[PDB]
Coordinates of C-alpha atoms in Angstrom, one line a residue:
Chain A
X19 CA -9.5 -56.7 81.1
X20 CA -5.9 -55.7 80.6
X21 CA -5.0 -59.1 83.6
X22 CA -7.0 -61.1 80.9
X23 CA -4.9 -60.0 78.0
X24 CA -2.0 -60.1 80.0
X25 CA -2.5 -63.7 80.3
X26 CA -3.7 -64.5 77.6
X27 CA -1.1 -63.3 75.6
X28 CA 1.5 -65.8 77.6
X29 CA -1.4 -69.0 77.3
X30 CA -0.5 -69.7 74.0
X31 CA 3.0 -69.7 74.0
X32 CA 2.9 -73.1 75.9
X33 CA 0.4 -74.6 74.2
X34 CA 1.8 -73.7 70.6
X35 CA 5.6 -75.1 71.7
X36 CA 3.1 -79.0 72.6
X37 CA 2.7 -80.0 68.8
X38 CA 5.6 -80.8 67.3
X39 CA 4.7 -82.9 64.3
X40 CA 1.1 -81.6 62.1
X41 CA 1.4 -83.9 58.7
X42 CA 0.5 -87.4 59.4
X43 CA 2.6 -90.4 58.1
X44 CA 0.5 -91.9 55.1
X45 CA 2.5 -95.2 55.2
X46 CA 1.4 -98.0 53.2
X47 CA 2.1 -101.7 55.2
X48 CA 0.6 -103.9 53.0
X49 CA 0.1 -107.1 54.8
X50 CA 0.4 -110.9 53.2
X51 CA -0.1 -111.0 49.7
X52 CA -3.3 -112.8 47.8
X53 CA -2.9 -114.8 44.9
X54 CA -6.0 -114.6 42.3
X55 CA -5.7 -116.2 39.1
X56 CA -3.6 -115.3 35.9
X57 CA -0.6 -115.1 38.5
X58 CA -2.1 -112.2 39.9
X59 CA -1.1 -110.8 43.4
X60 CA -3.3 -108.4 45.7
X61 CA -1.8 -106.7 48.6
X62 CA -4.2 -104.9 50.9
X63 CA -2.6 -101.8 53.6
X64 CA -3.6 -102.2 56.8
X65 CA -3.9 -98.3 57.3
X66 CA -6.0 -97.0 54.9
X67 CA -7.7 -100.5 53.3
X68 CA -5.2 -99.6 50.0
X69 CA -5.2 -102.7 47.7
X70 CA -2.6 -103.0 44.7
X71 CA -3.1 -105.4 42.2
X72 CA 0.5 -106.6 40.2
X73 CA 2.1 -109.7 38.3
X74 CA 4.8 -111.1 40.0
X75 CA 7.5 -112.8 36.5
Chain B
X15 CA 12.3 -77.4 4.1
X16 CA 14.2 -74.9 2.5
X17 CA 15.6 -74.9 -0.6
X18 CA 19.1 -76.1 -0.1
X19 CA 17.9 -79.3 2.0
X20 CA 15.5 -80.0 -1.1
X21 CA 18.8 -78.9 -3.4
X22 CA 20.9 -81.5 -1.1
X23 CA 19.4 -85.0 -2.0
X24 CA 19.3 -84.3 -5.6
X25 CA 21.3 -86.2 -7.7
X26 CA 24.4 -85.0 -9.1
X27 CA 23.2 -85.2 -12.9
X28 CA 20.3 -83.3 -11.9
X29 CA 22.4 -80.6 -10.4
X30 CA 24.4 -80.0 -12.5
X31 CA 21.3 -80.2 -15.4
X32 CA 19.9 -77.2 -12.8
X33 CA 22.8 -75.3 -13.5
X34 CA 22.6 -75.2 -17.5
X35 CA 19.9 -72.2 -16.8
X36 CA 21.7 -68.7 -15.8
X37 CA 18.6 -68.1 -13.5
X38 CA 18.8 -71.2 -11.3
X39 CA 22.7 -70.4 -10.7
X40 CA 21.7 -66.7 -9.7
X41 CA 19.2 -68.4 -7.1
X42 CA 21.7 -70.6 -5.9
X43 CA 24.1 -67.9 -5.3
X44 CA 21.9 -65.5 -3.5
X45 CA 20.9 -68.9 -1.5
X46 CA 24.3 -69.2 -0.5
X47 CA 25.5 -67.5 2.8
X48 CA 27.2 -63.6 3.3
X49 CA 30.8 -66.0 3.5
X50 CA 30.4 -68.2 0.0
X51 CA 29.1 -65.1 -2.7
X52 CA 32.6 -63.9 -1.5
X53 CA 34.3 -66.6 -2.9
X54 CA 32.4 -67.4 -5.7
X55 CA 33.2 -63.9 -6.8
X56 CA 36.9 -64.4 -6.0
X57 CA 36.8 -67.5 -7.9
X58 CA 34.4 -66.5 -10.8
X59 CA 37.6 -65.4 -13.1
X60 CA 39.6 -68.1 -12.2
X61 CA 40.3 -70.8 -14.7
X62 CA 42.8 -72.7 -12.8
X63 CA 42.1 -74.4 -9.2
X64 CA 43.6 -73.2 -6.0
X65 CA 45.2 -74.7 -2.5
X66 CA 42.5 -75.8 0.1
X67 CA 45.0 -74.1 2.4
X68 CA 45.1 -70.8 0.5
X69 CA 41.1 -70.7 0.7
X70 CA 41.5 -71.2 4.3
X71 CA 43.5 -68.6 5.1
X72 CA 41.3 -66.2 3.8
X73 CA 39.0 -66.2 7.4
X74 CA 40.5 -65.7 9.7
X75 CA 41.0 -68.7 12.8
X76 CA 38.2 -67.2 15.0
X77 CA 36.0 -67.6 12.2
X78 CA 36.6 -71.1 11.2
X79 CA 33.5 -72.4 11.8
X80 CA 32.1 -70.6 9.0
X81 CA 34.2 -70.9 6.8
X82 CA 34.2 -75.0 6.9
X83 CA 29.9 -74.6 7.2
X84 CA 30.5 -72.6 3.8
X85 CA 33.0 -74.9 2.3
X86 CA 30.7 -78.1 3.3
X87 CA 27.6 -76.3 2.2
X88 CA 29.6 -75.4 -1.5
X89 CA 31.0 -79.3 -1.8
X90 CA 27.5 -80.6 -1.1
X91 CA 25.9 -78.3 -3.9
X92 CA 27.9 -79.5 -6.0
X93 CA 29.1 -75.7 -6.9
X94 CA 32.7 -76.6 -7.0
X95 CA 34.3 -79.9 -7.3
X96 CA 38.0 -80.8 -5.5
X97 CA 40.8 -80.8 -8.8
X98 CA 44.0 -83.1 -8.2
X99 CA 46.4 -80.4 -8.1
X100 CA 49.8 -81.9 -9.5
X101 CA 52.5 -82.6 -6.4
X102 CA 49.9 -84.5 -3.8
X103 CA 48.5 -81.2 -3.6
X104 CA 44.2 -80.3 -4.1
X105 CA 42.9 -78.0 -6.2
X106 CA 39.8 -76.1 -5.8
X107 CA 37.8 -75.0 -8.7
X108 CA 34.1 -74.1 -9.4
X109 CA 32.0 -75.9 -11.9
X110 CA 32.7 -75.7 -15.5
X111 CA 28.8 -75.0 -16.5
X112 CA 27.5 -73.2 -13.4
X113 CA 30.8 -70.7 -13.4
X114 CA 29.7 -70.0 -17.6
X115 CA 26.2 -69.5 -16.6
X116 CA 26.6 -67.3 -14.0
X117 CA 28.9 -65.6 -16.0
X118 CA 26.3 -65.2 -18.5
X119 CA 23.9 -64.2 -15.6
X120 CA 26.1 -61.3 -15.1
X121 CA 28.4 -60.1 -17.6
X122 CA 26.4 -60.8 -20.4
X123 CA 26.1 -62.8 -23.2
X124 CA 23.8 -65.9 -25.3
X125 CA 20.3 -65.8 -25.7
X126 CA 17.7 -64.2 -23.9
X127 CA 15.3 -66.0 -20.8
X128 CA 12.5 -65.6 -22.9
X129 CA 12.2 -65.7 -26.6
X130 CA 10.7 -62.1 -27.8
X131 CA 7.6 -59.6 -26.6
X132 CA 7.3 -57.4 -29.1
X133 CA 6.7 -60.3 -32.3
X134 CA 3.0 -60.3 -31.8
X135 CA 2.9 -56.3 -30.4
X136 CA 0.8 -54.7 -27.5
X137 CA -1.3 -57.2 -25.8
X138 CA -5.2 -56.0 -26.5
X139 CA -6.5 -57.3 -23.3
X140 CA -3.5 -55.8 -20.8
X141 CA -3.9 -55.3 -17.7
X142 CA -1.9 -53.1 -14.3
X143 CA 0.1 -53.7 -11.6
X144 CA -2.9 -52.9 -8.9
X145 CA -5.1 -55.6 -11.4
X146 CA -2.4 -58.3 -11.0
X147 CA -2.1 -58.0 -7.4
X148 CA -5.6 -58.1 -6.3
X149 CA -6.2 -61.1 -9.1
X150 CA -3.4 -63.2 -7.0
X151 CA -4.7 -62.0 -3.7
X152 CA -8.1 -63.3 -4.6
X153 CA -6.6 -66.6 -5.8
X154 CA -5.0 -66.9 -2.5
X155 CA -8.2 -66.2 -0.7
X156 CA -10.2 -68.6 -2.5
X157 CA -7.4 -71.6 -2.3
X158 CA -7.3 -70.6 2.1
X159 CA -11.2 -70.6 2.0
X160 CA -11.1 -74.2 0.0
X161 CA -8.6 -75.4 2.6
X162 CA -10.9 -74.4 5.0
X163 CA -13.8 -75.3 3.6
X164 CA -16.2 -72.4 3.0
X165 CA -18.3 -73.6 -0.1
X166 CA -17.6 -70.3 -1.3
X167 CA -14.2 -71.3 -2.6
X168 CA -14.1 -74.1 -5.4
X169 CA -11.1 -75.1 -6.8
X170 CA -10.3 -77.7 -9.6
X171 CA -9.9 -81.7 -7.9
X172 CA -6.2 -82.4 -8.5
X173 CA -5.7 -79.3 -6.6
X174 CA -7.9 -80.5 -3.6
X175 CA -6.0 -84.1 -4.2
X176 CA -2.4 -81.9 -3.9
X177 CA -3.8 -81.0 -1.0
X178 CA -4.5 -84.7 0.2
X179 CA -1.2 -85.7 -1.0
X180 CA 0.3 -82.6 0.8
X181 CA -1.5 -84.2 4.2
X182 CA -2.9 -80.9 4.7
X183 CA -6.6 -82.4 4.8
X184 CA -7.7 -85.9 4.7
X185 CA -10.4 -87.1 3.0
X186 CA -11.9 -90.0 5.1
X187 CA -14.3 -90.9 2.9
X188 CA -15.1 -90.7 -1.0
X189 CA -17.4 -88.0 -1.7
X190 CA -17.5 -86.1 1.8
X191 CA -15.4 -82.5 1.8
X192 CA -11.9 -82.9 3.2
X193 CA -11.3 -82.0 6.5
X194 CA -8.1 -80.1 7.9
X195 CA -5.9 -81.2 10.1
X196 CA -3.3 -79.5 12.7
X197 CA -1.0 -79.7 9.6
X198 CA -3.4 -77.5 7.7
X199 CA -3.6 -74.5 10.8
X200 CA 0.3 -74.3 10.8
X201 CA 0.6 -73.6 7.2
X202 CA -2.5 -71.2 7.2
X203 CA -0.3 -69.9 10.2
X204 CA 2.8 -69.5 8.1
X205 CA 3.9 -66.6 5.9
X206 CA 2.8 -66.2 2.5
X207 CA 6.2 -66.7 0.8
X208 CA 6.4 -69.5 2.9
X209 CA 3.6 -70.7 2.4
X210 CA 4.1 -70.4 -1.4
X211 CA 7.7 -72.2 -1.2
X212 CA 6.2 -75.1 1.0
X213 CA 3.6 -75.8 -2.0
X214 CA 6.0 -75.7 -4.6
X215 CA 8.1 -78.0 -2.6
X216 CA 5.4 -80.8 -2.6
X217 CA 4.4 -79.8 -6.0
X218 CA 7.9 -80.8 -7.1
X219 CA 8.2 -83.9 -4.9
X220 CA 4.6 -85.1 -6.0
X221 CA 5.4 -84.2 -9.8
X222 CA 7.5 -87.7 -10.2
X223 CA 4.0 -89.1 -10.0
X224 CA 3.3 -87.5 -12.9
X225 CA 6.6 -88.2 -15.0
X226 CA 7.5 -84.7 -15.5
X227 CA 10.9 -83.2 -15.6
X228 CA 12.2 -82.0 -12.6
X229 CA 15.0 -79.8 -13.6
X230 CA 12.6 -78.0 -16.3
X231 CA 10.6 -77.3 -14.1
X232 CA 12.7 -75.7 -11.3
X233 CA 14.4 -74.0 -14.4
X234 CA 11.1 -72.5 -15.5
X235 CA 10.3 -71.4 -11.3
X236 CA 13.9 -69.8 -11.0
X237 CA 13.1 -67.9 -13.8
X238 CA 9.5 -66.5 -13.0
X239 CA 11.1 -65.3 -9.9
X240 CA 13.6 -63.3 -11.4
X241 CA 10.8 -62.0 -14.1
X242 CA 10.0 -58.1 -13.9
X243 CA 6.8 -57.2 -12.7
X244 CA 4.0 -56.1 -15.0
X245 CA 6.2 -57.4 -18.3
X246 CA 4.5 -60.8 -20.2
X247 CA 6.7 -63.3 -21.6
X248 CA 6.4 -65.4 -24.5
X249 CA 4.4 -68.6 -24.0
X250 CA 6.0 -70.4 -27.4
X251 CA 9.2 -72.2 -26.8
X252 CA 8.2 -74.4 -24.0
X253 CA 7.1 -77.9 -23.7
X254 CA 3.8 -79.3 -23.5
X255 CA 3.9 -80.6 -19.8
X256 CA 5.5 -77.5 -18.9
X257 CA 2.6 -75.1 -20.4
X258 CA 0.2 -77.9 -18.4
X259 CA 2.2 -76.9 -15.3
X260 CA 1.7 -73.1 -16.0
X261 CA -2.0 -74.1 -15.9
X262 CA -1.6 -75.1 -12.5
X263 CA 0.3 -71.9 -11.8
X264 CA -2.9 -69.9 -13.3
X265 CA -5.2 -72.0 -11.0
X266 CA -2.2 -70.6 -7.7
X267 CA -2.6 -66.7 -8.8
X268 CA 1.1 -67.0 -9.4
X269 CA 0.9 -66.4 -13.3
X270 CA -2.1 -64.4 -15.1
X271 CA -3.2 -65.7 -18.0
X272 CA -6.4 -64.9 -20.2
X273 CA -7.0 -68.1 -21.7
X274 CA -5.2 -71.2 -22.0
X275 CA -4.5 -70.8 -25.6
X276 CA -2.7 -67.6 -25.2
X277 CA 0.8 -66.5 -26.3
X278 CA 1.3 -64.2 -23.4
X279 CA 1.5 -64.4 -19.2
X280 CA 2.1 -62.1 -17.0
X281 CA 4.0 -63.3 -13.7
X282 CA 2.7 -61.7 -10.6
X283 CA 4.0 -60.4 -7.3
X284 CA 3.6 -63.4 -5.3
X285 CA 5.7 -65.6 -8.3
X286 CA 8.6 -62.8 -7.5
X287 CA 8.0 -63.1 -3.8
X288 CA 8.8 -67.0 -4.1
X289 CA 12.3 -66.4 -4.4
X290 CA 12.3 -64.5 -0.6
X291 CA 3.9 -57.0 2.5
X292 CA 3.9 -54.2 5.5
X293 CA 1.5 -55.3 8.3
X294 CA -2.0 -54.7 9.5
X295 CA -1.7 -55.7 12.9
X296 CA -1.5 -53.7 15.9
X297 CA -0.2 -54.7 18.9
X298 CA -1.1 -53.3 22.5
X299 CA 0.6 -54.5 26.2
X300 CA -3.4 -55.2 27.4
X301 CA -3.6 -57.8 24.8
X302 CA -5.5 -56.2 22.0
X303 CA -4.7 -56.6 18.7
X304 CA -6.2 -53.9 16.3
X305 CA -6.3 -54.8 12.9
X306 CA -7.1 -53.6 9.9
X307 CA -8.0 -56.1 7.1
X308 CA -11.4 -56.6 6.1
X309 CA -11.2 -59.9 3.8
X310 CA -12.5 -63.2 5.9
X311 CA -9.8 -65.1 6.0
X312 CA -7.4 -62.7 8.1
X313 CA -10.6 -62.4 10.2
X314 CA -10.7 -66.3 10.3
X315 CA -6.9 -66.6 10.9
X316 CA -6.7 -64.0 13.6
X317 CA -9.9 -65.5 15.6
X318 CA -8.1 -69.0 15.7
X319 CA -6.2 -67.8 18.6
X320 CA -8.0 -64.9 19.7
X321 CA -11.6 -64.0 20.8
X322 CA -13.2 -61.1 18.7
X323 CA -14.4 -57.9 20.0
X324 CA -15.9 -55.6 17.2
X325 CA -15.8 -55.5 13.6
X326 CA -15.4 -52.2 12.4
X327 CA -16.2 -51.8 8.6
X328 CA -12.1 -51.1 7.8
X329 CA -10.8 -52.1 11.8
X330 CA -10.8 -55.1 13.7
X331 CA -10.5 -55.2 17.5
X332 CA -9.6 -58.4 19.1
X333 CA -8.3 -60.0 22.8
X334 CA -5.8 -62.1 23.7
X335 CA -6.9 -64.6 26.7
X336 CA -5.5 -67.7 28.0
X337 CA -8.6 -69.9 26.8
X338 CA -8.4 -68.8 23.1
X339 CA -5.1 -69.1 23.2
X340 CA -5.2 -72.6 24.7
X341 CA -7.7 -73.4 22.4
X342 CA -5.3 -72.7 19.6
X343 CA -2.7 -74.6 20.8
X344 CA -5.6 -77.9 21.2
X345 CA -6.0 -77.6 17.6
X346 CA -2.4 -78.0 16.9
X347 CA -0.8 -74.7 16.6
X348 CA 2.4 -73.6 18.7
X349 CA 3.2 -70.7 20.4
X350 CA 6.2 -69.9 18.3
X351 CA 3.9 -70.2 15.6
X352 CA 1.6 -67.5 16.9
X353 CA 4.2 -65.0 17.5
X354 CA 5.8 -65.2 14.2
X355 CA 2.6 -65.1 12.1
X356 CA 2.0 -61.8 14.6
X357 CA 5.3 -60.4 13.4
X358 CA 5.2 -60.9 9.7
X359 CA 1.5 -59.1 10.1
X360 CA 2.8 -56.3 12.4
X361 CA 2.0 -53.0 11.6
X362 CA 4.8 -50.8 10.4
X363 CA 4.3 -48.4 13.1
X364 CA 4.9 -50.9 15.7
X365 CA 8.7 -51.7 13.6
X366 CA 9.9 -48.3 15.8
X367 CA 10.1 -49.4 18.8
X368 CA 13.4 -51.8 19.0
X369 CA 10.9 -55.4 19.6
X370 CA 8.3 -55.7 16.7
X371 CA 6.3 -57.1 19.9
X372 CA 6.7 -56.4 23.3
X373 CA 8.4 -58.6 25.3
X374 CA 5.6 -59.3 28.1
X375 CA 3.0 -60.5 25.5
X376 CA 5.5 -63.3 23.7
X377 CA 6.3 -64.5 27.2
X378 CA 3.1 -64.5 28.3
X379 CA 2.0 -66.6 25.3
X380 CA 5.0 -69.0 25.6
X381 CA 4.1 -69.6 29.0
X382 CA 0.7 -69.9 28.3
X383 CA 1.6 -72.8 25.8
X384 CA 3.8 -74.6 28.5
X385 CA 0.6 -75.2 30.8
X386 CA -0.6 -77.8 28.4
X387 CA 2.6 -79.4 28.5
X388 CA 3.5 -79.3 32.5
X389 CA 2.2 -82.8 32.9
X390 CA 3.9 -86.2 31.3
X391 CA 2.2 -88.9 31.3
X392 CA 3.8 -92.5 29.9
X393 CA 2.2 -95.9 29.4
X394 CA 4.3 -98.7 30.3
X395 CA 5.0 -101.1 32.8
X396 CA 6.9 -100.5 35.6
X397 CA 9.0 -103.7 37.5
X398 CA 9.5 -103.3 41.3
X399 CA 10.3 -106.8 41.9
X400 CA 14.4 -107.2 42.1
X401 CA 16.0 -109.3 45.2
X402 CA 19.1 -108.0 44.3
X403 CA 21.2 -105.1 42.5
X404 CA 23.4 -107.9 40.2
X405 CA 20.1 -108.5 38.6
X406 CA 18.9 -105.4 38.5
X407 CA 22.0 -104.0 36.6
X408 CA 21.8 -107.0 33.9
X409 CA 18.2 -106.3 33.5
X410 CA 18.6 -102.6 33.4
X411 CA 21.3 -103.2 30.7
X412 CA 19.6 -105.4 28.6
X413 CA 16.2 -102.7 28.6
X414 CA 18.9 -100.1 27.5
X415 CA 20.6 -102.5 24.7
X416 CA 17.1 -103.3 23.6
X417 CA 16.1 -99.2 23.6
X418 CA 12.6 -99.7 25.1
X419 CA 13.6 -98.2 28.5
X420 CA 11.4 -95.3 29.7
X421 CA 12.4 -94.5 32.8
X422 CA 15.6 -96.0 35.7
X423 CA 16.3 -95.7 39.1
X424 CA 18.8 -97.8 40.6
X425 CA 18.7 -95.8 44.1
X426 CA 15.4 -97.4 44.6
X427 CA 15.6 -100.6 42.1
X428 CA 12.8 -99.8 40.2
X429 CA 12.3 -99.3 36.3
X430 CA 9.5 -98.1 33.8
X431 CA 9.5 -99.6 30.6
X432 CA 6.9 -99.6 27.3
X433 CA 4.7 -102.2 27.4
X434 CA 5.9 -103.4 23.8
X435 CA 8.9 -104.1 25.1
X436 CA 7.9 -105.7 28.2
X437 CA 7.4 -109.5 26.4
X438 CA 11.0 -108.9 25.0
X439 CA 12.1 -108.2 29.0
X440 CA 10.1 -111.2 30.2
X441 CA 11.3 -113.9 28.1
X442 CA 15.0 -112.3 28.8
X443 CA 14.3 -112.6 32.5
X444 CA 13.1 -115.6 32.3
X445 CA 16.0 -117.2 30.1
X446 CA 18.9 -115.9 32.9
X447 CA 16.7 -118.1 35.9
X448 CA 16.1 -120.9 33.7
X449 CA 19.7 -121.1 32.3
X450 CA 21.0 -120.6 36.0

């Protein structure tokens, strides 16, 4: 028992210097823009499906 | 308002028609601040003007500021007026009429405030002090409870339009009972003498309506402040819209009166308050308030912003928690509000201690009142759309020239503005392509 502890007090120190970055990048890369009517523009992200509707003067 | 802001857009005619009573100057002069009853005394015996530079060497240079605040509050009422001294030089020197009447005021001399008491003897129906009070604290009650709207309380209709005109409580439709507004809470929440001073105010603003004369009537106000307690005047010797006025006052607990028709009135202690009792309210750090009224409308006031516990017969024992208090604050009453109306009403065993309140509780309850206001929201319309930073700046300046711009950030070329303005911005930015 005191061999496991040993080693398992030194497993994790490896594994917990292996991650370096936790928060993922939320990035939104709308792609070509869509032109409905009443000069309206929708662009639609390509990493979460985000769509934002605007008028473009 | 206060008086000297209400004192400062008058006319001078009016003013100096306000000064012609000894008791209006007196009111002015104890109005005035701890730096300007020091010169008017100084300057009271004076019948020849002095240097602007003399007077201002009389404070010293450290203390400059007050001294012009005095000297700008005197020259806008009116109490002295700028003499060409011979030479180039200016002369100051008080008003001819208001230095005689205050004069008067003091030293002595002319006719009495009120015509005579003892022509038609003892009154047969007098009444006490105690009597008096508890008549005006009862019309107070009754005129809270109508501006609540307990049925209880009935008071004559050009009162409850006063009221309407006052934009205490709107009446959205004939017929139906008013209803009070935020407007309403904060003056319940207000002291008495303020209270008192704020109607009076609108009173005289809404009496043009009416075609009455201002200065009388200020004249005859000034001088039921200054009136001693438990003594009745002489009704004779004032004009009919005036007496009609007094009505008014008799309907406000101000002024007791028997019936309409008699020669005597007896001013009461709320009348001598206007011109400015020791607390029921007990204060404890767990946020208790023990109180000890028993009428309904304290009860009423105090459970605006606090959640009642029990009602003892002669105690009232209440808690302070975030939700009542944020309740208050929904229906329009601030936090600064609160803690005032919690000082007036303090009880004089809690004036020991150096804080009338503790310090924990007030800062509690201001930050309480911040939570509603940690999030700002704006409608507008936000434009994200600039190729390059010459057009942004133009665009940016134009927004500011035209004062519709909410919010700028140049770092990142993007700019909120209200949507009202946003046709304005449109045609603007459409004129500097099309002209290109």
């Amino acid at each position: 028992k005191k061999f496991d502890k040993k080693v398992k007090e030194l497993r994790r120190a490896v594994r917990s210097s292996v991650w370096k970055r936790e928060t993922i990048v939320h990035q939104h890369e709308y792609g070509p823009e869509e032109n409905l009517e009443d000069d309206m523009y929708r662009k639609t992200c390509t990493m979460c499906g985000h769509e934002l509707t605007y008028e473009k003067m | 308002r206060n008086l000297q802001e209400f004192l400062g857009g008058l006319s001078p005619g009016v003013l100096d028609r306000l000064y012609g009573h000894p008791a209006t100057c007196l009111a002015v002069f104890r109005e005035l601040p701890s730096l300007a009853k020091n010169w008017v005394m100084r300057m009271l015996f004076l019948e020849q003007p002095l240097p602007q530079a003399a007077v201002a060497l009389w404070v010293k240079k450290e203390f400059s500021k007050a001294q012009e605040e005095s000297t700008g509050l005197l020259s806008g009422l009116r109490i002295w007026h700028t003499q060409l001294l011979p030479g180039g030089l200016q002369g100051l020197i008080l008003n001819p009429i208001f230095r005689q009447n205050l004069r008067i005021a003091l030293l002595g001399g002319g006719k009495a405030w009120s015509d005579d008491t003892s022509q038609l003897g003892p009154d047969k129906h007098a009444r006490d002090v105690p009597s008096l009070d508890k008549y005006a604290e009862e019309r107070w009650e009754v005129v809270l409870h109508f501006m609540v709207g307990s049925p209880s309380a009935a008071v004559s209709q050009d009162l409850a339009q006063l009221l309407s005109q006052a934009g205490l409580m709107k009446s959205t439709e004939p017929g139906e009972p008013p209803c009070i507004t935020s407007a309403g809470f904060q003056f319940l929440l207000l002291d008495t003498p303020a209270q008192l001073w704020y109607f009076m105010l609108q009173y005289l603003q809404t009496a043009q309506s009416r075609g009455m004369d201002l200065v009388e009537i200020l004249s005859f106000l000034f001088q039921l402040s200054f009136s001693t307690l438990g003594k009745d005047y002489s009704v004779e010797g004032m004009s009919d819209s005036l007496l009609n006025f007094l009505q008014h006052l008799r309907e406000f607990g101000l002024v007791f009166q028997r019936k309409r028709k008699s020669r005597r009135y007896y001013p009461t202690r709320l009348a001598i308050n206007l011109s400015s009792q020791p607390g029921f309210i007990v204060v404890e750090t767990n946020y208790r308030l023990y109180a000890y009224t028993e009428s309904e409308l304290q009860i009423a006031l105090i459970a605006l912003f606090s959640e009642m516990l029990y009602r003892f017969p002669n105690m009232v024992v209440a808690q302070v928690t975030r939700e009542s208090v944020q309740q208050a604050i929904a229906s329009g009453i601030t936090a600064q509000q609160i803690i005032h109306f919690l000082r007036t009403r303090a009880h004089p065993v809690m004036l020991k201690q150096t804080p009338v309140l503790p310090p924990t509780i007030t800062d509690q309850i201001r930050l309480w009142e911040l939570e509603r206001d940690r999030l700002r929201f704006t409608e507008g319309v936000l434009y994200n759309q600039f190729l390059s930073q010459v057009d942004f700046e133009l665009l940016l300046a134009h927004a500011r020239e035209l004062g519709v711009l909410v919010f700028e950030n140049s770092a990142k070329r993007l700019m909120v503005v209200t949507p009202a303005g946003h046709s304005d911005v449109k045609r603007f930015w459409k004129r500097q392509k099309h002209s290109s």
